Design an enzyme around this catalytic site. Structure first.
Site, PDB file in Angstrom:
ATOM      1  N   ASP A  88       0.775  -1.247   0.000  1.00  0.00           N
ATOM      2  CA  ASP A  88       0.000   0.000   0.000  1.00  0.00           C
ATOM      3  C   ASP A  88       0.806   1.298   0.000  1.00  0.00           C
ATOM      4  O   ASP A  88       1.299   1.722   1.048  1.00  0.00           O
ATOM      5  CB  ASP A  88      -0.959  -0.011   1.207  1.00  0.00           C
ATOM      6  CG  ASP A  88      -1.810   1.255   1.296  1.00  0.00           C
ATOM      7  OD1 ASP A  88      -1.989   1.906   0.256  1.00  0.00           O
ATOM      8  OD2 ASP A  88      -2.309   1.599   2.392  1.00  0.00           O
ATOM      9  N   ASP A 138      -1.777   5.664  -5.173  1.00  0.00           N
ATOM     10  CA  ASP A 138      -2.181   4.766  -4.089  1.00  0.00           C
ATOM     11  C   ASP A 138      -2.462   3.324  -4.495  1.00  0.00           C
ATOM     12  O   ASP A 138      -3.562   3.009  -4.950  1.00  0.00           O
ATOM     13  CB  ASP A 138      -3.432   5.404  -3.493  1.00  0.00           C
ATOM     14  CG  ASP A 138      -3.942   4.712  -2.267  1.00  0.00           C
ATOM     15  OD1 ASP A 138      -3.477   3.620  -1.892  1.00  0.00           O
ATOM     16  OD2 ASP A 138      -4.849   5.304  -1.670  1.00  0.00           O
TER      17      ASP A 138
END
Ligand SMILES: COc1cccc(CNC[C@@H](O)[C@H](Cc2ccccc2)NC(=O)c2cc(C(=O)N[C@H](C)c3ccccc3)cc(N(C)S(C)(=O)=O)c2)c1
Length: 389
Positions: free
Chosen positions: A36, A232
């Site tokens: 992430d 992201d």
């Protein structure tokens, strides 16, 4: 250049998130960790949960250190609470090193873990600025660089499949690559274009123009980064600020008007299906985002296809039908360049040179008539103005 050892070390090709194998504690406890770039906490399930197949057992690790401090982390989607501590961590198919990192032992969670996803933790690769409780909690990658000689940058190739994959398939297939400390030429084609990291908190960037099939959305560029724009890998969609989302959707609707879809489709809530093999890709427009370049007054653009923004979903009725969900959605917290964007490109997080590079991914999905693209340069001006304050 060649980090063959790490090539293909990711899984989740058509799952809920791309993850890498990691081990924590002594003896090593194996866990699949979601990659992430959208957050900065390293956290792992540490107690049983309906969706976890395994979890972190601190009592069994001789190197575990309890910091006697709780931590709470709410994301746009999901949230968890846990207990801070540190322990030794390794990455089986990463560099051959061991580092003592901060680890949040998840004890309570809500809408965080995903049924069947196959990952039991999350590796926040962004900067300390956004770590919880506060920026004093050193993120994993920072610990890694400080404790070893691994260069300060990593690169990601997330591979979508273009069609649904079942349980055994996802486990038996390569989901992509995370090259820690380098760049592997085999993961992309053509040139790598770099855009500056505006500020080191999220991997924030600046978008200066947006096109739908070559047609300029023609909005004040600040609108594109209204609040902020981030890369992201922990977010599925290409998320856009309300104003931008509405304008993009209106233009995508117009480009594909030969076919009419229910509002639920555009909201990303209901899937659309076509007879097997008849998906009309060509009626859907490509989407280009222009990014500020490293050279003054210079910009480049990344272009994706409907194969990136229409995500494959297995239809309820086994039907040979090919179904998909619209994966472009609304945001109240700025642009989020999620998996919809990353599956089309090889992305380099060059933390050392404070920049992010994009190159066409050797694994992006496409058809015989169009491919994703990265092209430059373009002479655009006062792009400094595109940033939001
Ligand atoms: C520092 O903390 C914050 C606080 C707020 C926002 C952010 C930026 N968001 C990026 C990530 O940190 C978090 C991390 C995460 C949360 C929950 C499960 C797994 C991962 N991502 C999300 O909040 C987040 C995750 C998902 C999601 O389904 N992620 C899965 C795991 C995924 C699927 C496919 C490809 C990549 C990831 C969806 C959304 N939606 C908004 S959507 C439907 O428009 O795509 C948000 C960070």
């Amino acid at each position: 250049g060649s980090f063959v050892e790490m090539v293909d070390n990711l899984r989740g090709k058509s799952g809920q998130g791309y993850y890498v194998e990691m081990t924590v504690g002594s003896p090593p406890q194996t866990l699949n960790i979601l990659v992430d770039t959208g957050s900065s906490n390293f956290a792992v399930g540490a107690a049983p949960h309906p969706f976890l197949h395994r979890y972190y057992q601190r009592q069994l690790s001789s190197t575990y250190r309890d910091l006697r401090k709780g931590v709470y982390v709410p994301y746009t989607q999901g949230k968890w609470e846990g207990e801070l501590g540190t322990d030794l961590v390794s990455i089986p198919h990463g560099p051959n090193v061991t580092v003592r990192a901060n680890i949040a032992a998840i004890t309570e969670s809500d809408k965080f873990f995903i049924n069947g996803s196959n990952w039991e933790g999350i590796l926040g690769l962004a900067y300390a600025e956004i770590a919880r409780p506060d920026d004093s909690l050193e993120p994993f990658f920072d610990s890694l660089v400080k404790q070893t000689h691994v260069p300060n940058l990593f690169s990601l190739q997330l591979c979508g499949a273009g069609f649904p994959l079942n349980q055994s398939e996802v486990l038996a297939s390569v989901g992509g690559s995370m090259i820690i400390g380098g760049i592997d030429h085999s993961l992309y084609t053509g040139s790598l274009w770099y855009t500056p990291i505006r500020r080191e908190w999220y991997y924030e960037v600046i978008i200066v123009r947006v096109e739908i099939n070559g047609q300029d959305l023609k909005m004040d560029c600040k609108e594109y980064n209204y609040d902020k724009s981030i890369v992201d890998s922990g977010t599925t969609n290409l998320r856009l600020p309300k104003k931008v989302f509405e304008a993009a959707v209106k233009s995508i609707k117009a480009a594909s008007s030969t076919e009419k879809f229910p509002d639920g489709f555009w909201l990303g809530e209901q899937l659309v299906c076509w007879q097997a093999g008849t998906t009309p890709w060509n009626i859907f427009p490509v989407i280009s985002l222009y990014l500020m370049g490293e050279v003054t007054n210079q910009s480049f653009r990344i272009t994706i296809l409907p194969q990136q923004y229409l995500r494959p979903v297995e239809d309820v009725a086994t039907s040979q039908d090919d179904c998909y969900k619209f994966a472009i959605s609304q945001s109240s917290t700025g642009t989020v360049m999620g998996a919809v964007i990353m599956e089309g490109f090889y992305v380099v997080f060059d933390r050392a040179r404070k920049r992010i590079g994009f190159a066409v991914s050797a694994c992006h999905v496409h058809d015989e008539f169009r491919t994703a693209a990265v092209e430059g340069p373009f002479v655009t001006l006062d792009m400094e103005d595109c940033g939001y304050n």
